Design a protein around this ligand. Sequence first.
Ligand SMILES: CN(C)CC[C@@H](c1ccccc1)n1cc(NC(=O)c2n[nH]c3c2CCC(C)(C)C3)cn1
Length: 240
Amino acid sequence: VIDPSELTFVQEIGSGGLVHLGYWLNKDKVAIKTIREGAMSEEDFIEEAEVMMKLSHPKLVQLYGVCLEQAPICLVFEFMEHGCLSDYLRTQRGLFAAETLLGMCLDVCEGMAYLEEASVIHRDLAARNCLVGENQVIKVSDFGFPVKWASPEVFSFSRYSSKSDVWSFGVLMWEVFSEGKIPYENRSNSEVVEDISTGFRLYKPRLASTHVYQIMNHCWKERPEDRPAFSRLLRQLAAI
Ligand SMILES: CN(C)CC[C@@H](c1ccccc1)n1cc(NC(=O)c2n[nH]c3c2CCC(C)(C)C3)cn1
């Protein structure tokens, strides 16, 4: 529990919740997330915190604490210098070597393999939900309808698992290797459901080798039983 007097709100850096750049004990930068008017409840925030406060891994954005004596309450996170991965890919497009893109996927895979070990389902993995830090390190952002990133059992039946996160991770790999292109030419959710149900899959980005592309396709097997766990993907990505 963080006392409100320990935080300084500097400026807005995000909204959709609201996020501010702040300082913690007037020295260190933090990202302070507050609930948006009434978009979501405080109990939801509390549930996120109860999950995230038990977790710590270098490729997961860290939740430092909760400020209970704010109205509404706020969550205090690790500040990620360069913002969201989706914007970063798009903004720096044409400057990335394949090896760099691979390293970004490995970062995320490491975060996700930790979540998998910890029995936590992300449920909304996407480049827009990854952040870029110092030295271009990628970290997975917070957790606790996006059809374009959803496995067929998720879009059809809300059947979430680590294996549905695997499907999402395959799409994220496609985003990374495509330098922030929007999956499925930004087709509608109805059309994407129809695409994936019939067996359509995303085509190979230029910067993805044949080998990388087969790992992506493995992530997009129709049955979750047929997709690799994150522990197995991590060994595959690390061996490249
Ligand atoms: C140039 N532009 C692309 C990046 C600008 C950058 C920034 C912002 C203010 C002061 C210095 C640098 N910036 C850095 C962020 N970081 C975050 O939004 C962030 N850092 N940690 C978290 C978040 C957003 C999501 C979170 C769950 C609150 C955790 C946003 N903008």
